[PDB]
Amino acid sequence: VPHKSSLPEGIRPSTVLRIRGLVPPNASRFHVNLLCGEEQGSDAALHFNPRLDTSEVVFNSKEQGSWGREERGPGVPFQRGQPFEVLIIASDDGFKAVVGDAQYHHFRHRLPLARVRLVEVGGDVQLDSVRIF
Amino acid sequence: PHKSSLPEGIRPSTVLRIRGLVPPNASRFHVNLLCGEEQGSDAALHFNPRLDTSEVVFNSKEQGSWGREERGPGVPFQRGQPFEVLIIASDDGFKAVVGDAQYHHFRHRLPLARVRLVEVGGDVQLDSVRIF
Numbered sequence: 001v002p003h004k005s006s007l008p009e010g011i012r013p014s015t016v017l018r019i020r021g022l023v024p025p026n027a028s029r030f031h032v033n034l035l036c037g038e039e040q041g042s043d044a045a046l047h048f049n050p051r052l053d054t055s056e057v058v059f060n061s062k063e064q065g066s067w068g069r070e071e072r073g074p075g076v077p078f079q080r081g082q083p084f085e086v087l088i089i090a091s092d093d094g095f096k097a098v099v100g101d102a103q104y105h106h107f108r109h110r111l112p113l114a115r116v117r118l119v120e121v122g123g124d125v126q127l128d129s130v131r132i133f
Numbered sequence: 134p135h136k137s138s139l140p141e142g143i144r145p146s147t148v149l150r151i152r153g154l155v156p157p158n159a160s161r162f163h164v165n166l167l168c169g170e171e172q173g174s175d176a177a178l179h180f181n182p183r184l185d186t187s188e189v190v191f192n193s194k195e196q197g198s199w200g201r202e203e204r205g206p207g208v209p210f211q212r213g214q215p216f217e218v219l220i221i222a223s224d225d226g227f228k229a230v231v232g233d234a235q236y237h238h239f240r241h242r243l244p245l246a247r248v249r250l251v252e253v254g255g256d257v258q259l260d261s262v263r264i265f
């Protein structure tokens with residue numbers, strides 16, 4: 001079952017989102033979104049989208065209904081049927097995505113961090129824990 | 134132990150991840166954020182789980198003198214058992230996470246830019262020390 005939780009005060013630099021779970025053996029894609037929260041179909045400071053089906057991990061933002069320029073991570077550090085741990089570390093300059101034991105990609109901010117009011121984790125993924133530190 | 138230099142220091146949003154095991158005969162181990170490799174160097178953070186006295190002590194040290202100790206709530210470590218600690222450097226302090234829970238927040242005494250070395254030692258067997 002997905003995760004959706006409010007960050008009504010916003011997230012500050014040095015906020016750490018730790019997500020642990022398992023990629024199902026038949027997974028296509030899942031996502032981690034940091035959103036405006038006002039509703040859904042609204043602005044995304046971070047859309048982190050591992051796609052097992054097309055063998056890519058896409059990063060993007062969305063403002064006023066329009067996607068920005070996609071960034072892609074190096075390789076796919078996820079595997080169908082295998083557990084994973086992701087850290088998303090909010091800094092002053094961007095989001096550091098850590099998967100497993102290594103920094104995976106650094107996504108510089110497009111929206112101010114103060115615009116993040118909701119965390120959503122969904123799609124083809126089984127969640128063990130979503131913690132905000 | 135683990136002892137590694139930080140060329141450019143640590144910046145806010147640095148995450149230090151430590152995985153290992155407390156040996157069955159442990160007394161104490163520590164995680165230090167120090168200004169340098171020399172003896173008695175200043176410590177921005179001294180994080181000291183003490184199995185022998187059933188406490189977790191945090192402190193700083195400047196010009197040879199320890200500051201006022203802080204103690205964490207309970208001892209989330211046990212002899213013979215593995216552990217995972219996160220130390221998260223922010224602009225306001227060091228957040229210590231043990232297992233699945235925020236454990237203690239240690240507000241900065243020394244400037245963060247003075248941290249140039251990370252040391253993990255004492256009665257601990259390490260699986261991983263990673264800086265993110």
Ligand SMILES: OC[C@H]1O[C@@H](O[C@H]2[C@H](O)[C@@H](O)[C@@H](O)O[C@@H]2CO)[C@H](O)[C@@H](O)[C@H]1O
Binds near residue numbers: 047049058059067070
């Ligand atoms: O940018 C992330 C979004 O991508 C959308 O599809 C992209 C696709 O990744 C790209 O190859 C090309 O076809 O442009 C499409 C539209 O931007 C997804 O539909 C959406 O879910 C996001 O993942």
Ligand SMILES: OC[C@H]1O[C@@H](O[C@H]2[C@H](O)[C@@H](O)[C@@H](O)O[C@@H]2CO)[C@H](O)[C@@H](O)[C@H]1O
Binds near residue numbers: 181190
């Ligand atoms: O503040 C950390 C240092 O504690 C020293 O031991 C203290 C002890 O915590 C206190 O209860 C009292 O007995 O004074 C002792 C000496 O200052 C340790 O010796 C030192 O290694 C640090 O951990």
